[PDB]
Paper text:
When immature virions reach the low-pH environment of the trans-Golgi network (TGN), the trimeric prM3E3 spikes rearrange into the flat-lying conformation, characteristic of the mature virus.
Because the available 3.6 Å resolution map did not resolve unambiguously the presence of a lipid, we carried out our own cryo-EM reconstruction of DENV2. We found that no virus could be recovered after exchange of His437 (equivalent to His447 in SPOV) to either a negatively charged glutamate or a small and neutral alanine.
Author numbering:
A (entry chain F), E (entry chain D), F (entry chain B): 92 to 163
B (entry chain E), C (entry chain A), D (entry chain C): 1 to 494
The structure:
C-alpha cells in the first residue's frame, strides 16, 4: 500500500515541520521495539544466526539489527 | 521589528562590492540584515502564491464496487469472458476454481472463473504541478522604525509586501522614509517545482516529490481526464478473495486517507482552499541597499529625557528590546542609544536598530540592540535626563560561537549548497566552498536517495566504523568526517 | 483385400491366450491380421468423427482500425486521456512527442500523446477443444472373401463399418459369412485430445497442440465470448509508429492467414466443414477372433479347372494377388492354392488370403499370397486341371529383415510407446520392453520437446561425438546409440 | 525558429574558407547553423519527392486457385502429362500415390500423379525503383527572424522551400531580408536508390533493400510484364498435400500481408498515394553563407522598454526561447540581448538567435539563446528600461560533454562515414578521420552484413571476451574497442 | 518463408524509427523467452550438453544460449 | 510474430504428412543457405571468430554453424 512507502529521504525537508513530524519520525523504532517484544524467539534466533555468521565482533551486531529491522 | 518575535532569526553584517549581500529567506524563519551606515531591514518570506496549477494525475483513495457479476468456465475450455471486460471501468480478474458435476459442468478440475465489478471512485485526491514561472513569493520587509506595537507584529501594516515573480525578477521596494531597496530573487532556482507535486486530499495539501507521487500504488487517472470513470491500476484498491478455490469474491479496500496520511511523513503540509499557498521552502537572492538611506539622519541630538515603557526583554538569539517614550521637546530626533560597560571606557555592544528616532511625541519607540556578554549598561538619554538601565546577558563568546556553528550546520543541512550563499559577499573562497559543497551534496543525494533517518544513522555509524578501521592515510579521516556529517544529518532531520 | 492397394501395409501373424492381438490402426495405414485356423481381415481407420466441439479461443487473423483518435499533452503535465480508453475495444497506446510553442504548448520537451483506434476484427480463426469421450473412429473391416472387385476397393460396400466410441469400449463386428469379431479399442489412450485443438480458419482445419495454440501472438478472445468485440493482446495485430517524434500513427497489420499457414508446418490438416473429421493419428485395439470363423471351411476341394483372369501382380511388400475364375461344377468349394519351389518338394510360401473359396459360378475370385524369394510355382488347381504359374519374387532374407526392421523403427518413431503394443501377444518380455520404451520416450519428449528436425540432427551428432569421446565404459555406447536414435528420428520426420 | 520544436536538433558553429560548412540534413532531425558575423539558419529536410517510378518486380501476397485438375499415372509408366503443364499460369507438382487394382491399375506400387491449378493472384504488392537523379529533396530554411509564429511552425509560410535535385546540385535560397544562401548537394552520393526498392502494398509503402526485395519467397513477375498471368516461383503460395498417399490436393495459402509486415521490422514506412514521398534518410552537403548577410545589422540599439509576451522556456538541448515585445518608439532597432552571470561582469551565454531585431510595432519578437549551466541573468533592455530575468539551467559541463558525445556517437552509428562530414570545416585531420571511418564501416558492413541487434550484442560481447583473453600488445585494445562499438551499435537500434 | 529473414541489419536504418520498431526489437527475445519457459527440459538438456563440451567455462554458456536461441 | 514459432517437434507427428511437409522441412535450411550466399562476409567472420575461440578443432565448426543458423 501507500503507507508502506514513506516520503522520508526525498530531500524536500525544510525548516518548517513536515506532516506527522513528531510521531512519524520515531514510529519505525517503536514498531520494531514492540515487534521484538512480541516475538522474542525470532529475535534470539536472528541474534544467534548473526553471531555464528559474523565472526568479526562487529558484523554480528550489524546483521542482527538488520534482521530485526527488515522484518516488519 | 517583525523579525524579533521569530524564534529562528538570522543576523547579516556584510555589504561589499556594490552594497549587495546574498541572503536566503525561509518561510519559518526571517533574516535581519544591517550595514555600517545603512538602516537595518527585516525580510520574511511570508507566503508563496503558486498560480495556474495543472493536474497531472488523480489517485483514488476510496471507491465502491457496483454491478458485481461473475461467471465460471468448464475446465480445459479456456477462460470465461464477460461483456463488462471490454469496459475498463469494470475491474476484473481471472482465477481457477474446483469445477465438477456439482457445479454444472462435466469435467473435474480447475475451471476458469472471472468476476467483474464496476470501479466507481467515490472520493479521491488530486495531484497538480505548477511551473516555476508561475510562482509568486510574498516577502515582507519591515524596517526597524520603532512603532508602538511594531515588535513581533505578524499582522502587517508595518512593512512592504513585495511579490517576487519570475516574470519580473528585478524589482524595487519603496519604503516609507528609508528610500528604496533592490531585491531580485528568481524563485526558479529556490525550491524548483519541476520535480514537486501539490497533492490535495480532503482540503489538506502537501508538497510531495514528483517521483514519489508517480509511483504511488493507488488507482490513478491522468490529469487530462474529465470524465473520471477510467482508472489505471485499480487492483491496488480492489482485491479478489478465492476461499477454498470455490468462488472468486471481489471487494474494494477501505479508504486510503489514513494510509496516505501515514505515507506523507516526509511531506510538508500547505494550504490549498482557494489558491495554492506554499508556506515552506527557501529563496536565496541578492539584496542591494545602495539606494537605501537612513530615516532621520538630518535630525540632531535632542536634549529631552526618555521614560521606560516596557522592560528590557532578551530575545532567543541574545538581542534585547527596550520600549522608551520621549518626554522632551522636539520629538523628531536621534535617540542617544548606546551600550557601555561599568567604567564606560568605550562602547562594547552593537545597536541593531540603526539610527533610532522618535517619529511622534508621546509615542512608544522600540529599540533593539545586541549587548555584549556579561554586565552592560544601556544609555538612552543625554546627561541631564539619562536612563541607566542594567542588563546581564548570560553566555560567553565560546558559547555564542558554538551556537553560531550549530545554526550554520543546521542551515547547511536544510538548504544544502544553498546555505553557502547566506551572507556571502563574493570572493574565491566562498565560491570554491559552495562548489565543493554542491558536488558533495550531489554525491550525497546520489548515494542517499530516499533513505530514512534511522537508516541514515545506521549508514553513518557504519562509515564511521569503516573510517576508524581503515588504517590508510588521507583516506580514513574523510570517512570519519562523512560518518560525522551523516550522524548530524540523521539527528537533525524532519 | 482393401489393404492390398495400401503402400504402408502391415501383417500380423499372432494369436494366443484367446486369439487376442493388440494392433494399432492408423489413418494413412492399414493392418492385415491373419492367423493359422482363423480368417484374415484388413482393418483400416478411415475416419474420426469429433462431435460437440467446445470453442477454446478465437484469434483474429485480419482486422481493421476505425475512429482513429489522437490527443497530445504538454510536457511535465501528465499523460493525455481519451473517452475511448475506457473501452477495451479501442486499442490505445501512449508515447512521447516533441512539444513546443509550434504545437500550441508553452514548454519545450517530451509531451505525452495517446493514440486510440477501434479494433474491429475482419476475420477470425476458431479454436475448438473436443473431449476424448465424444470421439467416433470409423474403422473399415474388409474380410479376404475373394471378390471380383474387393482388392483395393476404397469406395466401401465390401467390408463392415465400425464406429468405435469411448462410451462403448466393447463392441462386436458382424461380417457376411465369417461370423463376428471383437475389437476393444482405446481411443482415450491413443491420440488424446485433452492437449489438442481443432483450429479452423477459412475452411481449412488443423490439429494443433493446445500449448502451442494458447501462446499464439495474436488478438484473441475466450470461447465463452459471444459478442466478439473484446480482444486480448490487440498490440500483436496493431502497430504504433512515431515518425520524427511529431505524431503517433496507428496501423493495422495485414491478414495473418499466410503467417498462420507458414506457422502450421507441423500441424496436420483435417476436414471441418459440417463435421469434425480427423484423418490422422492412431487407434490401438485388442482384436479377438474366437467367434470369427472361416467362411467356407466346410467346403470340399473342387476338382474343376481354373482360369487366370488378372495376371499376377506383386505388391510393394512382396505379396502377390492372382485373380482366378472357377470353371467346373460345384461352385461352393475350397481352392487348392499352394506355393512351392521349382522341384515342388513342399509348400514353401505362405497364403495371405486364408482359405480361398469360390462364392458363385463365373465369379473371378482374388487370392493374395506371399511367395518366397527367388523362383516359385503357384499351384491353383487340382492334379487334372492345374495352373502352374511361375513367379520370380525379387529380394532376399536379409533384405526383408532390413525392410521390416526399418518399418518397425519408423513405427516406433511415429507412435512412440504405442508401436511396441503393435502385434503384441502379451508376456513379460514385450511388457518390460514397452515399459522401458515408454520411459525412454518420456525422457526424450522432456529433452526434445519442441525442437526441429535440423536441430534434432545437430543434437544427435553432438551426442554421438561426445559418446565417441567418452573414454569410460558403460557410458560411451549408450550415448552413441542415443545419438543414432536421434539421427534416425531427425531423418525420419514429417 | 522552426528548428526549436525539434527534439533531435544539432548546432553547427563553424565557418571557414569562404564560409562553407558541410551539414547532414535528416528528415527526423534538423540543423541549426550559426556564425560570428552571419545570421543563424535552420535547415530541415521535410520531404523527398521521387518521380518517374519504374516497376521492377510485383510479388503476390494473396492468390486464388481455380480449375484444379489432376491426373494419376500407373506405376512404371512415367510421369502423367497434362495440357496445363505447358501453361505457365497453372502451378503443378508431381508426386507418388498408391496404385493398384482398386484404382483401375494393373500393377501395385507408387504411381506418378500430377495436380495443376490455375494461379490467379487476387491481391499483390508492387516493387518500384527510382533513379537517383529522379529525387527531389524538399528542404525548408527558416532563418531566425523573430516572428511570434515562427518558433517550431511546421505549417511553413515562414521560411524558404528548396528543391534539391541531382540535375541541379548548386542552388540558391533567397530569404526575406537576410540575403541569399548557397546549397550544393548532388544527392547521388548518399542514399543510393539503385539498391533500394519502394514496396507498395495496400496503400502502405516501405523503403527496402533491393537484394532483400529480390530474394522474397513469393510468386513474382517482372515489372515489364503487363498481362500479369505468368508468375515465377508459385510454389511459395501453394501447398500440395498428399494425404495417405491417395490423392494430391493443392491448396492456396492465405494473404501474406501480415507475414510481409512481419518481414519489414527494419524497413522504414513512407507515403505513396499519388507521388513517392520519402520521409526518411539523410542528405549531407555543403552550405555557403558568403552571400548571406545579417538582417538589420545597420540598426541602432533602441532605448525603449520591453515586455515579456511569453515566459522563458528551455528546450531539450538547453537553449532557452524568450518572446518579448518592444514598447518604445523607433521600431526598426537592435535588441540589446545579453546573458551574464550573477555578478553581471561579462557575457557567458551565447545567443542562438544572433542579432535580434524588432520588425514592426506591436509584434512579439522571439529570441533563442544558450544560457550557461546554473543561474544566468538575461538582459533584454537598456539600462533605464531593462528586463533582467534570471534563469536556472540544470546540468554541468561534463554532463553536456557526455550528452554531445552520445549524440555524435548516435549520429555516427546512424550515418556510417557520412556523419564525419557533419559540421566539417575541411582540413587534413577530418579528411583522414572520415577516410578511416569509411574503411572501418566498409569492414563492418562486410562483417555485420545483416545481423540483428541481438546478434550484434552477442558478437560484441564475444569480441570483448576474446580481447580480454588476448595477451598480445596492440591487439587487445583494438579488440575491446571493436567489442564496445559493436555493443553501442546493437544498443542503438530502431 | 516470407515472414522469416526479416529486413533487419540491412544498413538502411536511419534517424527515423522503422516499421515495427517497438514490438519488433524485442520480438525475438520475447519469443525465445516464451519458448524456453514453455520447454525448460530442452533448456536444461542443452545446458548439460554444453557444460561437458565447453571445458573453458565460457564456451559452455555461449553454446547454451546459442542452442536455446537457434531453435525457432 | 506467429510465423516465427512453427509447429515442429510438438510430438503430434503421425504417419500422415503434416501441413507444409514438402517445403517446410527444408525451408529453414534453404533460407539459411541463401542468407549465407547473400552474406559471405558474416559467414567468414563467424568462421574465424569460432576458430579463434575454439582451439580444439571440433567446437570451432560447431560454434560457426550455431552462429550462422541462430541469425534469422
Ligand atoms: C449497474 O446497475 C444499475 C442498477 O442496478 C444500473 O442503473 C447501471 O446502469 C448498471 N451499470 C452498468 C450496466 O454498467
Ligand atoms: C499590530 O499592528 C496592527 C496594525 O497597525 C495594530 O492594530 C495592532 O495593535 C498591532 N499589535 C498587535 C499585537 O496586533
Ligand atoms: C466511428 O466512425 C464511424 C464512421 O465514420 C461513425 O459512424 C461512428 O459513430 C464513429 N464512432 C464510433 C464509436 O464508432
Ligand atoms: C504558424 O504561422 C501562421 C501564420 O499565419 C500562424 O497562423 C500559426 O498560428 C503559426 N503556428 C504556430 C504559432 O504554431
Ligand atoms: C477454367 O474453367 C472455366 C470454367 O468455365 C473455363 O471457362 C475456362 O476456360 C477454364 N480455363 C482453362 C485454362 O482451362
Ligand atoms: C468397387 O466395388 C464396386 C461395387 O459396386 C464396383 O462397382 C467398383 O467397380 C469396384 N472398384 C474397383 C476399382 O473395382
Amino acid at each position: 500500500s501507500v503507507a508502506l512507502v514513506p516520503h522520508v529521504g526525498m530531500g524536500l525537508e525544510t525548516r518548517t515541520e513536515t506532516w506527522m513530524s513528531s510521531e512519524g519520525a520515531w514510529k519505525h523504532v517503536q514498531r520494531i521495539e514492540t515487534w521484538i517484544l512480541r516475538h522474542p524467539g525470532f529475535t534470539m534466533m536472528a541474534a544467534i544466526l548473526a553471531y555464528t555468521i559474523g565472526t568479526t565482533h562487529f558484523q554480528r551486531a550489524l546483521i542482527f539489527i538488520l534482521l530485526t529491522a527488515v522484518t516488519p | 521589528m517583525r523579525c524579533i518575535g521569530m524564534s529562528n532569526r538570522d543576523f547579516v553584517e556584510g555589504v561589499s562590492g556594490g552594497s549587495w549581500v546574498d541572503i536566503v529567506l525561509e518561510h519559518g524563519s526571517c533574516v535581519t540584515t544591517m550595514a555600517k551606515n545603512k538602516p537595518t531591514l527585516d525580510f520574511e518570506l511570508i507566503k508563496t502564491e503558486a498560480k495556474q496549477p495543472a493536474t497531472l494525475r488523480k489517485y483514488c483513495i476510496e471507491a465502491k464496487l457496483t454491478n458485481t457479476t461473475t461467471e465460471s468456465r468448464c475446465p480445459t475450455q479456456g477462460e470465461p469472458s464477460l461483456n463488462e471486460e471490454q469496459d475498463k471501468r469494470f475491474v476484473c480478474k481471472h482465477s481457477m476454481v474446483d469445477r465438477g458435476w456439482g457445479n454444472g459442468c462435466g469435467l473435474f478440475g480447475k475451471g476458469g472463473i472471472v468476476t467483474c465489478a464496476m470501479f466507481r471512485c467515490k472520493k479521491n485526491m488530486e495531484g497538480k504541478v505548477v511551473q516555476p514561472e508561475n510562482l509568486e513569493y510574498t516577502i515582507v520587509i519591515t524596517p526597524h522604525s520603532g512603532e508602538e506595537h511594531a515588535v513581533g507584529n505578524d499582522t502587517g501594516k508595518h512593512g512592504k509586501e513585495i511579490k517576487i515573480t519570475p516574470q519580473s525578477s528585478i524589482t524595487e521596494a519603496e519604503l516609507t522614509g528609508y528610500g528604496t531597496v533592490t531585491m531580485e530573487c528568481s524563485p526558479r532556482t529556490g525550491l524548483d517545482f519541476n520535480e514537486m507535486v501539490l497533492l490535495q486530499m480532503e482540503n489538506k495539501a502537501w508538497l510531495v516529490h514528483r517521483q514519489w507521487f508517480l509511483d504511488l500504488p493507488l488507482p490513478w487517472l491522468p490529469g487530462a481526464d474529465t470524465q473520471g470513470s477510467n482508472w489505471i491500476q485499480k487492483e491496488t484498491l480492489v482485491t479478489f478473495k478465492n476461499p477454498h478455490a470455490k468462488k472468486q469474491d471481489v471487494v474494494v479496500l477501505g479508504s486510503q486517507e489514513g494510509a496516505m496520511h501515514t505515507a506523507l511523513t516526509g511531506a510538508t503540509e500547505i494550504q490549498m482552499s482557494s489558491g495554492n499557498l506554499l508556506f515552506t521552502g527557501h529563496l536565496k537572492c541578492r539584496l542591494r541597499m545602495d539606494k537605501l538611506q537612513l530615516k532621520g539622519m538630518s535630525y540632531s541630538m535632542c536634549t529631552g529625557k526618555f521614560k521606560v515603557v516596557k522592560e528590557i526583554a532578551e530575545t532567543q538569539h541574545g538581542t534585547i528590546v527596550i520600549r522608551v517614550q520621549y518626554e522632551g521637546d522636539g520629538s523628531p530626533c536621534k535617540i542617544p542609544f548606546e551600550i557601555m560597560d561599568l567604567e564606560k571606557r568605550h562602547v562594547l555592544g552593537r545597536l541593531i536598530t540603526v539610527n533610532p528616532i522618535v517619529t511622534e511625541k508621546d509615542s512608544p519607540v522600540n529599540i533593539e540592540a545586541e549587548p555584549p556578554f556579561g554586565d552592560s549598561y544601556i544609555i538612552i538619554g543625554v546627561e541631564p535626563g539619562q536612563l541607566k538601565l542594567n542588563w546581564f546577558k548570560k553566555g560567553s563568546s565560546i558559547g555564542q560561537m558554538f551556537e553560531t556553528t550549530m545554526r550554520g550546520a543546521k542551515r547547511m543541512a536544510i538548504l544544502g549548497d544553498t546555505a553557502w550563499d547566506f551572507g556571502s559577499l563574493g570572493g574565491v573562497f566562498t565560491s570554491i566552498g559552495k562548489a565543493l559543497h554542491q558536488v558533495f551534496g550531489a554525491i550525497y543525494g546520489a548515494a542517499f536517495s530516499g533513505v530514512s533517518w534511522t537508516m541514515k544513522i545506521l549508514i553513518g555509524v557504519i562509515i564511521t566504523w569503516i573510517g576508524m578501521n581503515s588504517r590508510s592515510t588521507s583516506l580514513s579521516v574523510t570517512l570519519v568526517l562523512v560518518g560525522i556529517v551523516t550522524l548530524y544529518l540523521g539527528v537533525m532531520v524532519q
